[PDB]
């Protein structure tokens, strides 16, 4: 699959509230902070004797993730997310699909 | 040790005991699902006609 690098879409930014041009980029899940309450509770919960205390997941089936975008309005920078289907191969650098060509 | 997978036996006796009551139909039904444009105009029109009838008999 392929997508362009810029897209005309609504920007609910409180002065646009209309279609502006949006630079697209991917969404990366973001590095995890320590000192978040789950991690703190987890370090305490695993602290000491008792062994593993929370489950841990292995029964994996999905060979794909949903791909997700960030849409930065060029004027307001009101970012925005919107999600797409599942794709094995993904690409933003789009060499267009020229129909009238050979093999 | 297999089992009986499915059957509709006796369900209609069970239903027709105290069964298939028609839904109570009512005057002045729900104006949900109705075109909201029409809902809105209908509101304002009823306000107008209530005012008019009260002014005809005040």
């Amino acid at each position: 699959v392929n997508v362009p690098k810029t897209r005309k879409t609504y920007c609910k930014g409180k002065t646009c509230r209309k279609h502006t041009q949006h630079k697209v980029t991917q969404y990366k899940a973001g590095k995890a902070s320590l000192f978040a309450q789950g991690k703190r509770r987890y370090d305490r919960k695993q602290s000491g004797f008792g062994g593993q205390t929370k489950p841990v997941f292995h029964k994996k089936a999905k060979t794909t993730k949903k791909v997700v975008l960030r849409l930065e309005c060029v004027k307001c920078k009101t970012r925005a997310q919107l999600t797409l289907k599942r794709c094995k191969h993904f690409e933003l650098g789009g060499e267009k699909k020229q129909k009238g060509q050979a093999l | 040790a297999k089992s009986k997978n499915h059957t509709a036996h006796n369900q209609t006796r069970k239903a027709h005991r105290n069964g298939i009551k028609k839904p109570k139909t009512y005057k002045y039904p729900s104006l949900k699902g109705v075109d909201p444009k029409f809902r809105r105009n209908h509101k304002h029109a009823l306000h107008g006609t209530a005012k008019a009838l009260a002014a005809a008999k005040k």
Partner: protein, 159 residues
């Protein structure tokens, strides 16, 4: 696996027709629909938008709502032990009127005409329908119409 889809066991049902494939004629669109109108439901498989479910194929309902290219319809549906009201946002290609209701309205205005004539003369309308009552005596003649005696036929193989 067991397969139960929106358009399952529907092949011959949304088969359009013989010698009627392609587009739709225009009275389907020029017809009119109002609240309280009773309507029939047959589905045009050539119009894959606004369709009903095969349950509602060949059924009947009442209008409650009207929009650009579509109409609201109420139906009653047996679910276990009760009839449930079900609301459909259908397309007029799948809608049509109920001529039963049309003829009922015509009977109504004719009944009113009879009541008017009987207000004019006091002449005992008897408005109500009545069944095919049993028939009355008569005398059938025989002239040019003598009874031909008939009797059974023997067994012939007919091969």
């Amino acid at each position: 696996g067991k397969s139960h889809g929106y358009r399952s066991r529907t092949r011959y049902m949304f088969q359009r027709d013989f010698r009627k494939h392609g587009a739709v004629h225009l009275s389907t669109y020029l017809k009119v629909y109002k609240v309280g109108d009773i309507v029939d439901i047959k589905a045009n498989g050539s119009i894959q938008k606004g369709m009903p479910h095969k349950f509602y194929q060949g059924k009947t309902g009442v209008v409650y709502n009207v929009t650009k290219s579509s109409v609201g319809v109420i139906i009653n549906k047996m679910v276990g032990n009760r009839y449930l009201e079900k609301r459909l946002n259908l397309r007029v290609e799948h809608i049509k009127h109920s001529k039963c209701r049309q003829e009922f309205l015509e009977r109504v205005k004719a009944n009113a005409a009879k009541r008017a004539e009987a207000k004019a003369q006091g002449v005992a309308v008897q408005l109500k329908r009545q069944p095919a009552q049993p028939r009355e005596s008569r005398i059938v003649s025989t002239e040019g119409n003598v009874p031909q005696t008939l009797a059974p036929v023997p067994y012939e193989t007919f091969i």
